[PDB]
Design a protein around this ligand. Structure first.
Ligand SMILES: CCOC(=O)c1c(-c2ccccc2)oc2ccc(O)c(CN3CCC(C)CC3)c12
Length: 270
């Protein structure tokens, strides 16, 4: 219904605390089905799908829905990839409104090892990189990039400008557009500090295609970039690559750890 997917519905009344999961870059919350199978029986789960805007603007849409569904709390918020950033943003908004947030789970939602500057120089370097790949892939020499026109466009306007040159089945255009926009959303996220507990499940590395797009993701800090914003930070190493973190077998380890946290939350209510 709308942007909320029901993965496992909560009972008519009572029951366990729901897990709210948030979509990853370029995908939907169906990716959380393996995690769900590794959580306690009868754990409700609701997935928040894509909405438009900056991270804060998206959280402004999610947070009223979170409160409509769960009221005062307790809130358990989880996400892989972009979803981790969205969950974190929702935790800050809920906490601001005095709601009880008991768990924020970031599944390999790791910041770039060096801050990604949001400057005209970086816009130029980014698009020079993209053009070079376009030339080796589509086997076409590409002329001078109109830097002045690009540098005054939002990310959404930049892809519109790109679709023009191209002039693709609508389905392929929608997937590339939303994946590009969701990834840029990760790049430009401005993280605010959070004073609750955050659990970061950390893989060993980003995938090669990710690193080719933005080489700053080739390096990971021990705290995944979150320690300066989060004082109460716990990191759970899971190994492997980012893309595998959401799936079996690695998700079993995320799920075992998260199940224990949920059990404690349940005991603290009871
Ligand atoms: C799958 C490779 O394509 C990407 O990671 C990026 C895409 C993209 C993916 C699929 C289809 C079309 C585009 O767009 C990006 C824009 C900026 C950017 O930095 C990246 C690289 N990622 C940013 C966020 C990191 C957590 C992961 C890397 C992309």
């Amino acid at each position: 219904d709308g942007f909320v997917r029901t993965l496992r519905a909560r009972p008519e009344a009572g029951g366990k605390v729901p897990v709210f999961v948030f979509h990853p870059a370029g995908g939907s919350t169906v990716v959380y089905e393996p995690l769900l199978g590794r959580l306690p029986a009868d754990t409700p789960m609701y997935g928040f799908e894509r909405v438009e805007g900056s991270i804060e603007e998206r959280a402004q849409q999610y947070v009223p829905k979170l409160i409509e569904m769960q009221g005062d709390g307790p809130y358990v918020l989880v996400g892989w990839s972009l979803g981790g950033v969205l969950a974190y943003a929702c935790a800050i908004g809920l906490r601001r409104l005095g709601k009880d947030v008991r768990f924020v789970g970031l599944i390999d939602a790791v910041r770039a090892g060096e801050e990604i500057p949001q400057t005209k120089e970086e816009i130029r370097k980014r698009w020079d990189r993209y053009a070079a790949f376009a030339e080796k892939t589509f086997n076409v020499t590409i002329p001078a990039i109109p830097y002045e026109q690009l540098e005054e466009l939002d990310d959404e306007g930049q892809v519109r400008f790109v679709l023009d040159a191209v002039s693709i089945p609508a389905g392929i255009i929608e997937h590339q557009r939303t994946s590009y926009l969701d990834n840029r959303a990760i790049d430009t996220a401005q993280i605010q500090p959070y004073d609750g507990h955050v659990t970061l499940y950390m893989a060993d590395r980003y995938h090669d295609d990710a690193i080719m797009f933005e080489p700053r993701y080739a390096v990971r800090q021990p705290d995944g970039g979150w320690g300066e914003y989060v004082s109460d930070l716990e990191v759970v190493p899971i190994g492997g690559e980012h893309i595998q973190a959401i799936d079996e077998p690695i998700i079993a380890k995320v799920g075992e750890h998260m199940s224990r946290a949920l059990g404690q939350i349940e005991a603290d209510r009871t």
